[PDB]
Design an enzyme around this catalytic site. Structure first.
Site, mmCIF file in Angstrom:
data_model
loop_
_atom_site.group_PDB
_atom_site.id
_atom_site.type_symbol
_atom_site.label_atom_id
_atom_site.label_comp_id
_atom_site.label_asym_id
_atom_site.label_seq_id
_atom_site.Cartn_x
_atom_site.Cartn_y
_atom_site.Cartn_z
ATOM 1 C CG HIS A 41 -0.435 0.421 2.462
ATOM 2 N ND1 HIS A 41 -0.496 -0.510 3.602
ATOM 3 C CD2 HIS A 41 -0.044 1.616 2.832
ATOM 4 C CE1 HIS A 41 0.022 0.379 4.525
ATOM 5 N NE2 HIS A 41 0.245 1.542 4.171
ATOM 6 C CG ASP A 90 -0.446 -3.696 2.991
ATOM 7 O OD1 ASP A 90 0.252 -3.146 2.005
ATOM 8 O OD2 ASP A 90 -0.683 -2.976 3.888
ATOM 9 N N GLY A 190 2.651 5.967 8.950
ATOM 10 C CA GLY A 190 4.034 6.333 8.696
ATOM 11 C C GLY A 190 4.795 5.342 9.007
ATOM 12 C CB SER A 192 2.579 1.688 6.585
ATOM 13 O OG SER A 192 1.391 1.996 6.831
ATOM 14 N N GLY A 193 4.539 -1.063 6.657
ATOM 15 C CA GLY A 193 5.949 -1.390 6.131
ATOM 16 C C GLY A 193 6.873 -1.943 7.004
HETATM 17 C C1 LIG Z 1 -3.837 -0.059 3.965
HETATM 18 O O1 LIG Z 1 -3.697 1.170 2.909
HETATM 19 C C2 LIG Z 1 -3.221 2.213 3.640
HETATM 20 C C3 LIG Z 1 -3.043 3.367 2.856
HETATM 21 C C4 LIG Z 1 -2.602 4.380 3.431
HETATM 22 C C5 LIG Z 1 -2.146 4.624 4.447
HETATM 23 C C6 LIG Z 1 -1.635 6.043 4.960
HETATM 24 C C7 LIG Z 1 -2.276 7.139 4.691
HETATM 25 C C8 LIG Z 1 -1.811 8.463 5.251
HETATM 26 C C9 LIG Z 1 -0.457 8.436 5.837
HETATM 27 C C10 LIG Z 1 0.267 9.732 6.140
HETATM 28 O O2 LIG Z 1 -0.395 10.527 6.528
HETATM 29 N N1 LIG Z 1 1.507 9.883 5.836
HETATM 30 C C11 LIG Z 1 2.337 10.948 5.918
HETATM 31 C C12 LIG Z 1 3.041 11.676 4.726
HETATM 32 O O3 LIG Z 1 1.797 11.800 3.619
HETATM 33 C C13 LIG Z 1 3.512 10.461 7.162
HETATM 34 C C14 LIG Z 1 4.534 9.584 6.667
HETATM 35 C C15 LIG Z 1 2.942 10.191 8.325
HETATM 36 C C16 LIG Z 1 4.474 11.686 7.346
HETATM 37 C C17 LIG Z 1 0.152 7.160 5.868
HETATM 38 C C18 LIG Z 1 -0.509 5.919 5.680
HETATM 39 C C19 LIG Z 1 0.475 4.881 5.861
HETATM 40 O O4 LIG Z 1 0.782 4.056 4.899
HETATM 41 O O5 LIG Z 1 1.122 4.754 7.107
HETATM 42 C C20 LIG Z 1 -2.567 3.524 5.481
HETATM 43 C C21 LIG Z 1 -2.538 3.673 6.833
HETATM 44 O O6 LIG Z 1 -2.481 4.583 7.418
HETATM 45 N N2 LIG Z 1 -1.957 2.431 7.837
HETATM 46 C C22 LIG Z 1 -1.621 2.267 9.056
HETATM 47 C C23 LIG Z 1 -0.493 1.629 9.467
HETATM 48 C C24 LIG Z 1 -0.454 1.459 10.890
HETATM 49 C C25 LIG Z 1 -1.420 2.106 11.828
HETATM 50 C C26 LIG Z 1 -2.762 2.213 11.275
HETATM 51 C C27 LIG Z 1 -3.863 2.784 12.387
HETATM 52 N N3 LIG Z 1 -4.244 2.025 13.167
HETATM 53 O O7 LIG Z 1 -4.644 3.701 11.800
HETATM 54 C C28 LIG Z 1 -2.748 2.658 10.026
HETATM 55 N N4 LIG Z 1 -2.801 2.424 4.958
#
Ligand SMILES: COc1ccc(-c2ccc(C(=O)N[C@H](CO)C(C)(C)C)cc2C(=O)O)c(C(=O)Nc2cccc(C(N)=O)c2)n1
Ligand SMILES: [Ca+2]
Lengths: 254, 55
Positions: A41, A90, A190, A192-193
């Site tokens: 993702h 994912d 952030g 993620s991965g």
């Molecule tokens: C699955 O597809 C997706 C697609 C996109 C997102 C997602 C959406 C937005 C952001 C984000 O705000 N990113 C930033 C830059 O734009 C930054 C890296 C935090 C500085 C970051 C993610 C991310 O990948 O971590 C996410 C995501 O937020 N995942 C995630 C990871 C860990 C905990 C949680 C949670 N508990 O909410 C969510 N998932």
């Protein structure tokens, strides 16, 4: 990471920072000198495939101490079953353009064999999750790498302990739940991965990838992680293959 | 044998015909003569933390 602590510099040496145009994108896990495991993702919105960088030996984002090693990402390999904008399958396998040099601050995490991971690692209760992600839901990201110890749940127990929300994604056999339902500790945006690393008889192994959750550390919810054991054979086969032109590659899964 | 307590292996376990079991190790490690333990053969084996190992 919410409710964790700073990972003492060099104690998370497989942690990868992924950057796009120099900006924070996601985390990753180094599994040998050339290969990084991350989340599929993280690449949904990439257009500038040539500006994707992996940083190893990173700790503090505010200073360069000389242990950092940056590499261009030559290839991003995603399972054919992954659908952009969704949560299932994912996982991403990343080939670095040039190997990283192993040092006291840059060390791979062991990618385990499937049977060992399913029969033994899957029953180790606590594991470490780490990253430079948001310190709070709708909060600022960390300047120092953070780490959190989380307990793993059986999927039936995760579904039983979780509050119903509606239009929420299902927990598949390609995922697992880990963390706490009291709103205190979790992975966040952030992270993620990044790695979900499990200790067994003096060695650390890759068991999960930070994937998703219903807001960070939301009461009644757990963190969701990609179940890496489902992908061991898929990853091993790809790592034994010659590079192919083009940064993004979709590979058949299984 | 591998199903119960990892067949006594520190790392990987392979079941064989009858009461036979073979422990194995990840690359960068070798199996000790005990047939269960894994020892590093390289300076930076996977899944070990040098700053913790050195102290
Ligand atoms: C699955 O597809 C997706 C697609 C996109 C997102 C997602 C959406 C937005 C952001 C984000 O705000 N990113 C930033 C830059 O734009 C930054 C890296 C935090 C500085 C970051 C993610 C991310 O990948 O971590 C996410 C995501 O937020 N995942 C995630 C990871 C860990 C905990 C949680 C949670 N508990 O909410 C969510 N998932
Ligand atoms: Ca730094």
């Amino acid at each position: 990471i919410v409710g964790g602590k700073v990972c003492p510099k060099g104690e998370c040496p497989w942690q990868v920072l992924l950057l796009v145009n120099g900006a924070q994108l996601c985390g990753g896990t180094l599994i040998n000198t050339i290969w990084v495991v991350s989340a599929a993702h993280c690449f949904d919105k990439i257009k500038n495939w040539r500006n994707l960088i992996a940083v190893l030996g990173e700790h503090d984002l505010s200073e360069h101490d000389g242990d950092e090693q940056s590499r261009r990402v030559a290839q991003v390999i995603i399972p054919s079953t992954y659908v952009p904008g969704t949560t299932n399958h994912d996982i991403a396998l990343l080939r670095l353009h040039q190997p990283v040099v192993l040092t006291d601050h840059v060390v791979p995490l062991c990618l385990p064999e499937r049977t060992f991971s399913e029969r033994t690692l899957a029953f180790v209760r606590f594991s470490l999750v780490s990253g430079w992600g948001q310190l709070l839901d709708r909060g600022a990201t960390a300047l120092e790498l953070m780490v959190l110890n989380v307990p793993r749940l059986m999927t039936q127990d995760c579904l039983q302990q979780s509050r119903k929300v509606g239009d929420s994604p299902n927990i598949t056999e390609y995922m697992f739940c880990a963390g706490y339902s009291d709103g205190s500790k979790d992975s966040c945006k952030g992270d993620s991965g990044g790695p979900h690393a499990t200790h067994y008889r003096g060695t650390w192994y890759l068991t999960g990838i930070v994937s998703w959750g219903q807001g960070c550390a939301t009461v009644g919810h757990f963190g969701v992680y990609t179940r890496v054991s489902q992908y061991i054979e898929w990853l091993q086969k790809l790592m034994r293959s010659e590079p192919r032109p083009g940064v993004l590659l979709r590979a058949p899964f299984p | 044998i591998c199903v119960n307590e990892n067949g006594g292996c520190e790392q990987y376990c392979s079941d064989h015909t009858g009461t036979k079991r073979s422990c194995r190790c990840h690359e960068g490690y070798s199996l000790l003569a005990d047939g269960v333990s894994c020892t590093p053969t390289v300076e930076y084996p996977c899944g070990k933390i040098p700053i913790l190992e050195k102290r």
